[PDB]
Amino acid sequence: MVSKGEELFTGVVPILVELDGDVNGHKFSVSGEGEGDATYGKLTLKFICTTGKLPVPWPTLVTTLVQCFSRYPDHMKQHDFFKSAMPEGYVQERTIFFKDDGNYKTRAEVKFEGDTLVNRIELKGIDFKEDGNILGHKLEYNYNSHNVYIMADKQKNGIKVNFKIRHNIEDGSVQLADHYQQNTPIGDGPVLLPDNHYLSTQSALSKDPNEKRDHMVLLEFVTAAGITL
């Protein structure tokens, strides 16, 4: 039954995101702010590239830039690893393989800092093609819906997560980004290791007419499913 950490998510929670990036030696920093409400699985966020022009397409950073805000239905509360690790938080690590191009490796800590849920990430990208879809900025400013698959990793006292992101390319084709993810608790308290299940995601990217810096406005809804009453 319900974790103690779930109590921190009964209402709206402020969010901060900080990302340090280096892709093929192009350094950049992104900051985000907004809020999340796990009651509805809803994020309302805005991100800025504070260093100048972002050298990769914004869509490629969406999954790196807080799965504790997913809506878990009542019958699945005992399967919500993400909130159970709060407030001490979890480490989230990924490799993201862009088909026929380079990869991102990310390490993040997601935890409460005071009353704010904070996602702090280091991202390294290597082996990108200079005029590929990523470094050439050939991806549509859009996003798809996905199924995110979640499994327990008992040896690590955490979870493994796997999914494929589909990035629309300006010509009509699709760029696949294959995600391999692992999350482990930072603290020593009990956590919930789930039965296999999935998340269903929806996102929309937009722009703020009053923002002069390179930026991304993101609305996102995520719900957990796949375990029956």
Partner: protein
């Protein structure tokens, strides 16, 4: 700090302070740096009296924040029935769309607010509006446990994916069988009785049998195979069902798959056989079965 005090007065539910700030000429349509207005805040937080006085003074009922949300979206999400009613009576667009394409009716169905669903329908909500990912309000109610709302929507002629064709598929290529494979045996059985195609692959290449193996439902695995599921489906998935069963330690599923012709030599995209994956995942009991398989 005049519009900021009003935004803060509206956020904090300070009826009198809102009342006072507005006699001093406070911009009822003040907006913060993400497009949130006093009316958004009052409607989201359930401040009926503040909603009413802001509308009195000319608050824009359909103002949209950066995420496309109007006050009606926020009130319909939160369950604030009286506020929903007053926004509609004062000209709110009942079919306004957030940046995902959700109408208020989507949001009320998604959040379980049945009385709000009814009043949105009364005011002309489009019962079969689709968000940008193809979901109707019925889909959102029924996939998220709000059966009472789903019935109200169906009585108002709302439909959803698979309501006419058991072989329809959604945005991610999920058919009704893909959704049911996650432990809804009776539903799987009914869909198969009614002609559902067991071999359909989703946008990632997964068949219902893949999903049932992943989630560990033996009796669903069995029935899908009884109805002609390809025991060795892979194609774009990168794994067969036997690989999945071996990773997750589902011994009885391994045995059923083997009895139905599963291929012990199938390699995943990393060159691994089911036996290799059983060893790699600490499932030596499955490895033992696999290397003796008939």
């Amino acid at each position: 700090d005049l519009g900021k005090k009003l935004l803060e007065a509206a956020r904090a539910g300070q009826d009198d302070e809102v009342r006072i700030l507005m006699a001093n000429g406070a911009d009822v349509n003040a907006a913060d740096d993400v497009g949130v207005t006093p009316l958004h805040l009052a409607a989201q937080r359930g401040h009926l009296e503040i909603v009413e006085v802001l509308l009195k003074y000319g608050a824009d009922v359909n103002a949209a924040d950066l995420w496309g949300q109007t006050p009606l979206h926020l009130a319909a999400t939160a369950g604030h029935l009286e506020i929903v009613e007053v926004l509609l009576k004062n000209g709110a667009d009942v079919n306004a769309r957030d940046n995902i394409g959700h109408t208020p009716l989507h949001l009320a169905a998604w959040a379980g607010h049945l009385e709000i669903v009814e009043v949105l329908l009364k005011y002309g909500a489009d019962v079969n509006a689709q968000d940008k990912f193809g979901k109707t309000p019925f889909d959102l109610a029924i996939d998220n446990g709000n059966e009472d709302i789903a019935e109200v929507l169906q009585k108002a002629a709302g439909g959803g994916s698979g309501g006419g064709d058991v072989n329809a598929y959604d945005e991610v290529g999920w058919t009704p069988l893909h959704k049911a494979a996650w432990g809804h045996l009776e539903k799987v059985e009914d869909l198969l009785k009614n002609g559902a195609d067991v071999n359909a692959a989703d946008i990632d290449g997964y068949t219902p049998l893949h999903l049932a193996a992943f989630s560990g439902h033996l009796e669903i695995v069995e029935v899908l195979l009884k109805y002609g599921a390809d025991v060795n489906a892979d194609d774009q998935a990168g794994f067969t069902p036997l690989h999945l069963a071996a990773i997750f330690g589902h011994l009885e599923i391994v045995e059923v798959l083997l009895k139905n012709g599963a291929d012990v030599n199938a390699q995943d995209k990393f060159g691994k056989t089911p036996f290799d994956l059983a060893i790699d995942n600490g499932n030596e009991d499955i490895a033992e079965v696999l290397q003796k398989a008939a």
